[PDB]
Each structure stands twice: as C-alpha cells, then as structure tokens.
Amino acid sequence: RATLLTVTAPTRPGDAGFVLADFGAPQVRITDLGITRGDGVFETIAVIDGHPQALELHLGRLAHSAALLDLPEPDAAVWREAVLAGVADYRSRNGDGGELFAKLILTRGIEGEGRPSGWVFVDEGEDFSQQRLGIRVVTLDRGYRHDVAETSPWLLAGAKSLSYATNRAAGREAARRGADDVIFVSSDGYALEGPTSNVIVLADGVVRTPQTDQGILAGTTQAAVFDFFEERGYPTEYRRISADELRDAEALWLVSSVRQAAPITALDDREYPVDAALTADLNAYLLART
Amino acid sequence: TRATLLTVTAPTRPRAAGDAGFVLADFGAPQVRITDLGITRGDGVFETIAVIDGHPQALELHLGRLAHSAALLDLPEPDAAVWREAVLAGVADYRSRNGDGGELFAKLILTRGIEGEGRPSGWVFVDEGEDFSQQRLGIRVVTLDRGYRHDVAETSPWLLAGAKSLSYATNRAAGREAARRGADDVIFVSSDGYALEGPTSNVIVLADGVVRTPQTDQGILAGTTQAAVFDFFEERGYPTEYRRISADELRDAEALWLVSSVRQAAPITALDDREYPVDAALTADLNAYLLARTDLEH
Ligand SMILES: Nc1cccc(C(=O)O)c1
C-alpha cells in the first residue's frame, strides 16, 4: 500500500536518480550508518489532496540538517522529483483519499563506502482527529542549555536527525504521567520545542514561539501558523520564552507537519482553555494551504 | 559476503526445539525495513564485542549491559540465552567459512521494531575488525562539552544517559570535530565540569600512583574494557578508584587512556594540545593483557 523509492543519487559531489522499491521487503543494509549509529537526517512532509505542503521549505531544511551533520549537500532536484513521483505512484494505486505524508531519509551510507543513502516513502498517516481537539502535555528537562547550538555545534541541536531515541523516550515519560506529549525546557529554564513539534504561545494577545536559534527546529508548520495569525490580525513574535511565561500564557498549541495544530488543554496538570472555533479555523487553514 | 549475519527472531522475553531464536542471513543483502524504528528514529540499543582467537571477550558483561541499556529505553528484556547462542553461532559460522586468524568483532543490534507492530527487531553480525595497531600506540584527544550535567541520569532519565543506544549521531559529530582540530578522539566534559567518557570509550586516569576512572552513575557507560583495565592495574599493585574527576584534575594527570572493546587501550599523547607522556612498555603490556584475558577463562 505504501510507496517506497530508493534514491540512487541523493547528494551532490537522463537518469531520474531514484527507483521504485518494495516497501514491505527489507531495504537497508545492517551496516547502514543510519541504523548502526542513527547517523542521518530526515524530513516529514504532509500531502493533502495530492499536494505536498511546504515542499520547498522542507527540502531547504533537509539541506540545513545535512549541513549540520557534515553530510554532502542533498540534490534538491532529485529529492523534489522523488517526492512528487512517490505521491503520484501512491495516488494511482490507492486512489485519492485521506491525508498522506512523504518521509525523506538521508544517511551517511553503508559503513566504509563513503556513499550516502536515501529513501522516500509515501503512506497514509495516523489519525489525529482527537489530538486536533486537545492534548495534555508535560514539560521535561532537555539537559542542554538554550545556547548549545552556538557553543557546542557537535551536539547537533536543531538538526532533524535520525537519532531520536531521546525524543521517543520523552513521549514514554509523558504517557507514564497521563500526558500525550512534551514541551522541552532548557536546563537554564527556557521553553524550546516538543519532541516532534514546535510550541505556539498566545500571551498578552500575541502569538509567540521560541526563537529558532535556541537549538530547535525552525518549524514549517509553525511558520504557516504565523501566516494564519498575521492575516487574521494577531501580532506574532519570535522570542525567548521562560518556563514560567509558559504556564502564564492564555493558550498553547504544539504544531508539526502531519498532526498540524494540536491545542493544549493541560500543561503539567494545570488546565488551559481551548478555543475550539479558533483552532478549527487554524487546522482548516493548515489543511487547505497551497 | 565475508561477514556473518544472524537474524534474531526471538530477541526479547514477553519455544519449540529446532527454533533457536535466530537463523543465518546474507550480510550483503538489505535486511532492515525502512520503517524499522531502529533507522527512522535511532530507537534501539547495541553492543560491540571483541572476538579474540574465536572467543568473545567479556560476553556475559556485554549481555548484561545490553539488558541494562534495553531497560533504560523501556524495551523488553533481551533473551540472554538466545543472544549468547546467536553470538557463538556467528563466530562459529564466520570461522568455518573464513578460517581463523585476525581480530574479529560481533555487533548486537536490538530495536523497537517495525513501527505499529509491537515486535522488537534483533541482529548479530560478525566480521573482521579495523586495524587499531597505530592507535594502540598513541592518539591525540580534545575535550568537548557534552551539554549535560554530570547528574542527568538521576534527574532526567528520559535523556537516556548511560544507555548504549543507536542514537549516536552526536557521538560521531564529536569525532568529526576532533578531526577538524587535528585529533583522533574526544573526552566529553559535563556542563558542570566533570570528565565523563569518550563517544565510544571510557577514560582511564593515572595520577599519584592511583588509577582512576569516572564513576559510572554520571550518565556514562560502565565499560567492559575499563573493568578489565582495573584488573590489570590491581594485579600490578596499583590502587584503583571510581570517582568524580573534574576536567581540571584530568589536565593534571600523569597519563591517560581511552579504552573500549575493539580498540582496547589507546594511550593519549596530547589532550587539547597539552602533551602527555606515554609509557610504551606499560601500555603494550596493558594491551597484551587485554588481548589475552579471555583465554584464561577457557
Ligand atoms: N572483501 C572480502 C575479503 C575477503 C573475503 C571476501 C568474501 O566474499 O569471502 C570478501
């Protein structure tokens, strides 16, 4: 059901540079540095009614993530055509239908070959209908200071890397606390991001989000959230947001490409009011864009 | 292919005779599904084990630590008897095809599995090790900020500190940073200034006739090689000590080693461009002890 493409020309030093492969058969060598060391980057792109959302920003961020890990530069033209070909292959077979997504995976390759690996696959996504009406959240220490990306770039803060064990570990801690998700806080007390998403704060009538140089991802959904609010007439701001400001905010959301906007009903067990109509308009906009 | 690969089909506790829990597979062919959480999320644990003269070194310690890493990641308990059997069968198959000769290694990989499926994945492969003869004579090292407080394992267990996980992108990034500075390896230093470990090794400190190593609740691995290194030094009358070692104390050390299963003991010639003496005979004796310890057990 899922479409998988192998990307045979993923990076820059009439061949398409990618081939269809069997999603249900093994495809990665046991010594691919992507699995023995989590040494790669990825992007997840939502595909709504056959259109990839924020395609160019996603491809640019793949290059940015690759650069942070000293990977070779991704061949934008090939990755672009592979996303489009995989969506086209999925829709032809499974027809039109629900929300889809394309996942791009780029690794340093089989150990010892100096030849990076790449895959794109396209599948139907998990159902987020409930999560888009509300989620509970806890804050968790991320260990790093908010300025790691300036002092210590070998820690890869702000790279969308394959090494997400700790991100997953954060989800499990949240579930043990009855929560659905996490907002990370830096060791010096600043709100950062979620394990798979960015945080949006409505406070003092302003739509805020932690500045993107604090070792976090510049979210593509977050940027689109800002366009929504700016056109609707809210002011928007990139800021350093302390842990305390978080709990004093009027309202909160986690946002990301596939789930879109998920409003926070509780943060660390303190309740927050969810404006159902405002969030519904937000998610309608996020789902309908370009 | 030269290397041996075993698929572990019963990696974890929740069997018919004839089902050992593992079967040979082609190391040269693709083996992992693209949605295995081991590659999409680096969500798994691993062990690397030196195999000297047909024998895996410290096999039970490694298996114990596989389980400990598994537990830190909320994975199910690895079936120690399947993994043990899998490693020995792998060593056996490698040697029956390739003969003996040479230092080998076995690598154990355990992941949360194909996503949506609730079934961990597991693999073992055996292959010839990298030539470390030069590094065993000396390496240049630099100190790099790890970003964590020495105590993150106590306060923040979701940060997986002290787990041997597949999410090693940063450990590799540290090596690339050291190479930029013309160095071979890295000693991590915590936010609060404590010597921790290397991205793939543990740190041994000689100072004032005492052999020390950072104590292993500081969000670091308890190294199987470090334990064998303590055995060597105690046998020669050195006192050994686990403790907190500030980055300052590390500079004032008389000698330093990075130790790990495959490279064994690599003596440090320079740390952040400060020179350190290397006792070539004592280190050669250390490596000879480290290479020969498992023969005793058999
Ligand atoms: N590269 C290499 C070296 C030796 C043997 C083989 C093999 O296929 O047996 C391969």
Residue numbers in the entry:
A (entry chain B): 3 to 15, 28 to 304
B (entry chain A): 2 to 15, 25 to 308
Text from the published report:
In general, transaminases catalyse the transfer of an amino group from an amino donor to a carbonyl acceptor with pyridoxal 5′-phosphate (PLP) as cofactor. Herein, we report the discovery of a new class of fold IV-transaminases, which was discovered during our quest for novel (R)-selective transaminases using an enrichment-based approach. In contrast to exclusive amino acid transaminases such as D-ATAs and BCATs, CpuTA1 and MgiTA1 are in addition able to convert amines to ketones, which would categorise them in the subclass of amine transaminases. Considering this and based on sequence and structural analysis, which revealed significant differences especially also in the active site, we propose that CpuTA1 and MgiTA1, might form a new subgroup in the fold IV family of PLP-dependent enzymes.
